[PDB]
Each structure stands twice: as C-alpha cells, then as structure tokens.
Swiss-Prot record:
Subunit structure: Component of the RNA polymerase I (Pol I) complex consisting of 14 subunits: RPA135, RPA190, RPC40, RPA14, RPB5, RPO26, RPA43, RPB8, RPA12, RPB10, RPC19, RPC10, RPA49 and RPA34. The complex is composed of a horseshoe-shaped core containing ten subunits (RPA135, RPA190, RPB5, RPO26, RPB8, RPB10, RPC10, RPA12, RPC19 and RPC40) where RPA135 and RPA190 form the DNA-binding cleft. Outside of the core, RPA14 and RPA43 form the stalk that mediates interactions with transcription initiation factors and newly synthesized RNA.
Cell compartment(s), UniProt: Nucleus, Nucleolus
Coiled coil: none
Family per similarity comment: Belongs to the RNA polymerase beta chain family.
Cysteine disulfide partners in this protein: none
Additional detail: Three distinct zinc-containing RNA polymerases are found in eukaryotic nuclei: polymerase I for the ribosomal RNA precursor, polymerase II for the mRNA precursor, and polymerase III for 5S and tRNA genes. Present with 14100 molecules/cell in log phase SD medium.
Function noted in UniProt: DNA-dependent RNA polymerases catalyze the transcription of DNA into RNA using the four ribonucleoside triphosphates as substrates. Component of RNA polymerase I (Pol I) which synthesizes ribosomal RNA precursors. Besides, RNA polymerase I has intrinsic RNA cleavage activity. RPA190 and RPA135 both contribute to the polymerase catalytic activity and together form the Pol I active center. In addition, subunit RPA12 contributes a catalytic zinc ribbon that is required for RNA cleavage by Pol I.
Protein name, entry field: DNA-directed RNA polymerase I subunit RPA135
Superkingdom of origin organism: Eukaryota
DNA sequence: TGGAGTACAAGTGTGAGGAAAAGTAGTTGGGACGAAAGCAGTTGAA
C-alpha cells in the first residue's frame, strides 16, 4: 500500500491528513541531464489546490 | 550273547527377515490533474 502511494501519488486515507489535495504527491525523477535531476530535490510546490484559482496573489 | 531304550548328526519343509531410493504424509511460508458563467423554461407562493 505504500508502494501504491509512491507509484501513483494518489493519497488514500480514511482520516484525511491535514492536506488539501489527494493527488500529485509524487513525481518521476527524470534523468534527461543532471540539471533536471538535481533540481527535483530543490523544488517546492505551493499546492495543487492553488493551480485552479484565477487570483495571481 | 540277542534286545530295550536313545543322543548325535545326516537330512527335509515352513516364512521372516534385510535393505534402499523412490514416492507421499502435515505444518509453515507465501501469491495478488476538475469546489466553471449568466440564464431559461418550469415553478415557488402571493
């Protein structure tokens, strides 16, 4: 079940964590060059809830 | 100066033992990209 989280990114939880989305939690570490690869690890994301908003604040 | 009993061995049927590497007997491990807008016929009660 932990592999299913890491294979899809879908968060199945009977509680619901304190988080506001249920998907996209894991990405593919690409190796097309090293700059692509090292910058997956310095990358941070605001949340997928904010990708659907029309406000640019 | 003949017979009555008799242990030592030559000699004859019954089954019972011996073994192994093939198979099979019960437990445990393990298999399984969507929280969009002004708007309209029906439809709320006045």
């Amino acid at each position: 079940k932990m592999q299913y989280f890491l294979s899809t990114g879908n968060l199945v939880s009977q509680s619901g964590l304190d988080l506001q989305q249920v998907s996209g939690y894991t990405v593919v570490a690409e190796k097309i060059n090293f700059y692509r690869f090292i910058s997956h690890f310095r990358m941070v994301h605001r949340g997928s809830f904010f990708a659907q908003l029309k406000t640019t604040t």
